[PDB]
Amino acid sequence: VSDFKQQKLEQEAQKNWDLFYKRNSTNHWTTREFEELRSCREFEDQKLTMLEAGCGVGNCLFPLLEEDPNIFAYACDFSPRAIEYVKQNPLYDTERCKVFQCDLTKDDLLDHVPPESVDVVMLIFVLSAVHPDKMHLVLQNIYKVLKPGKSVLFRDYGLYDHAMLRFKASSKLGENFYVRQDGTRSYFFTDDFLAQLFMDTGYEEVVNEYVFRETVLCVPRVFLQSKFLKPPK
Ligand SMILES: Nc1ncnc2c1ncn2[C@@H]1O[C@H](CSCC[C@H](N)C(=O)O)[C@@H](O)[C@H]1O
């Protein structure tokens, strides 16, 4: 295990993510995200407001803004370089999306998104970054913004995913919890763990299924793919 370095890696979780956005090129969302995105819409062109948590460069989101022109995207990420990288992109349309630095385990989302304002939150490959101790914090932060009948679309690394089977016991922070070389972490989800996180934080399970996919020598990538709902009043 990494012992004290863990507290160091946690303390620097933003920085390594910020550094990751430094060195790397801008450079994944399945159709399920896009297809389920529209299923949250009752009127055929109902205007939907979506929070894409952990936006990164929003490489996946920005086409979705073009593909569907009648949705608003509150996008946040705690990497400042990440945000500017989306700020710099020409596709950025201040009308389409409000992007803002937020560490979801620290910053109340009501600073930028009105409470119960968003139709759908996308937790795509983000919860694996945050420390498992603090994950429910991300879920509490996003409950505040979810309309009381709306849902969270979650895709993330799942148990026994390729990356989990590639890591040496030296990258292992703990059970199903690993640090990538650049110091960003990957937690490899199990259906039960995510379910409890969502149950504890007040959501209701719609879909919680492992999804197996072919990496682009291939061992399947295992992604835990799920939909959770804010219970209605
Ligand atoms: N506590 C936190 N608050 C905000 N963003 C976080 C975070 N922990 C991790 N992240 C973000 O998690 C992301 C993992 S990759 C995100 C991009 C992905 N294509 C997507 O659609 O979500 C990084 O952009 C990182 O900055």
Author numbering: 29 to 55, 61 to 249, 255 to 271
Give the text the authors published on this PDB structure.
Methylation of cytosine 32 in the anticodon loop of tRNAs to 3-methylcytosine (m3C) is crucial for cellular translation fidelity. We show that SerRS acts as the tRNASer substrate selection factor for METTL6. We demonstrate that SerRS augments the methylation activity of METTL6 and that direct contacts between METTL6 and SerRS are necessary for efficient tRNASer methylation.
To determine whether tRNA binding to METTL6 induces conformational changes in the enzyme, we compared our structural model to the crystal structures of METTL6 bound to either SAM or SAH, but without an RNA ligand. The methyltransferase core of all models aligns well. All RNA-free structures display disordered substrate-binding loops, which seem to adopt their shape only in contact with the tRNA, and a conserved helix following the substrate-binding loop is rearranged on interaction with the ligand. Our data suggest some degree of flexibility in the region of the β-extension hairpin, a region that is completely unresolved in the crystal structures, suggesting its plasticity for tRNASer accommodation. Thus, while the core of METTL6 is rigid, parts of the m3C-RBD seem to be more ductile, to accommodate the tRNA.
